[PDB]
Structures are given as structure tokens and as C-alpha cells.
Amino acid sequence: VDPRAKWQPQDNDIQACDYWRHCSIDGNICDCSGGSLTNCPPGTKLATASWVASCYNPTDGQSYLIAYRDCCGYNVSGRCPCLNTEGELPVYRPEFANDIIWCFGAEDDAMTYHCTISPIVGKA
């Protein structure tokens, strides 16, 4: 609803695109395909790389630094797709660029995009 409106995080449903940690998610939530909010689904490869974002936790009024690591080596799940860009910068500032495939580091050289986790990597 109003794709152009200010972002408004919630903290009650991790499979929804307005869940507070997915502020900078691009792709699909791992929770919808066998993974978890922070673990990869069976069979996929955990990347070492990621893009970061600092997202507001409406519940505690704090901000944490989210490391969007991709689970790879699989075709896109197709379930629960999102594209949030809270503070996303251009490609020439990768640490904060979300169109890049952050699969670097996955075992076996997996570079195909399956889903993305939203683990907290630290405040603020």
C-alpha cells in the first residue's frame, strides 16, 4: 500500500516485508523456504559477504546494524519477496548497495541467489 510511502517497521511478523530487520532486504526472506530469520535453509551455502543497514527496532526504540548475508547455490525461492531500501546508496558504495549478489564466500563457490537472512550484527 503506497509503494512510495515512508517505511514503517513492525515487529510481529518476520515473513512480512515491513518487519523491522528487513529495512534493507532485496530478494526473498529465508524464513519462507526452509531457513530462518538468521539461518540458511538446508542445502544452501552461507555467504561470508553482505550489505549492511541500520534499521530501527520499533520495539525498543533502538537501531541495529543488519548484515544481509545471502544463502546461495540455489535458484530463487520465489516465496516472500521484498525490496526495501532504507538508506541504500549507489553501487559505488557497496557496503550499502543492495542490487549486488552478496554470495561471496559461500562454500563450493555458490553465487546463485536463493534467499537472504537478517541477522543482527550490532547496535546502532
Curated annotation (Swiss-Prot):
Metabolic or biological pathway: One-carbon metabolism; methylamine degradation; formaldehyde from methylamine: step 1/1
Q: What class of enzyme is it?
A: oxidoreductase
What remark does the entry make about the cofactor? Uses a protein-derived tryptophan tryptophylquinone (TTQ) cofactor.
Q: Required cofactors, per record? A: tryptophan tryptophylquinone residue
Give all cystine bridges in this chain: C17-C82, C23-C55, C30-C115, C32-C80, C40-C71, C72-C103
One GO BP annotation of this record: amine metabolic process
Enumerate the UniProt keywords alphabetically: Disulfide bond, Electron transport, Oxidoreductase, Periplasm, Signal, Transport, TTQ
Annotated EC: 1.4.9.1
Report if keyword Transmembrane helix is assigned. Answer: no
GO-annotated molecular function: aliphatic amine dehydrogenase activity; methylamine dehydrogenase (amicyanin) activity
Give all Tryptophylquinone modified positions.
W51
Localization in the cell = Periplasm
Reactions catalysed = 2 oxidized [amicyanin] + methylamine + H2O = 2 reduced [amicyanin] + formaldehyde + NH4(+) + 2 H(+)
Residue intervals passing through the bilayer: none
Q: Which family does it belong to?
A: Belongs to the aromatic amine dehydrogenase light chain family.
Subunit info here reads: Heterotetramer of two light and two heavy chains.
**What the protein does?**
Methylamine dehydrogenase carries out the oxidation of methylamine. Electrons are passed from methylamine dehydrogenase to amicyanin.
* Protein name, UniProt field: Methylamine dehydrogenase light chain
Which stretch of the full-length chain is present here? 64 to 187 of 188
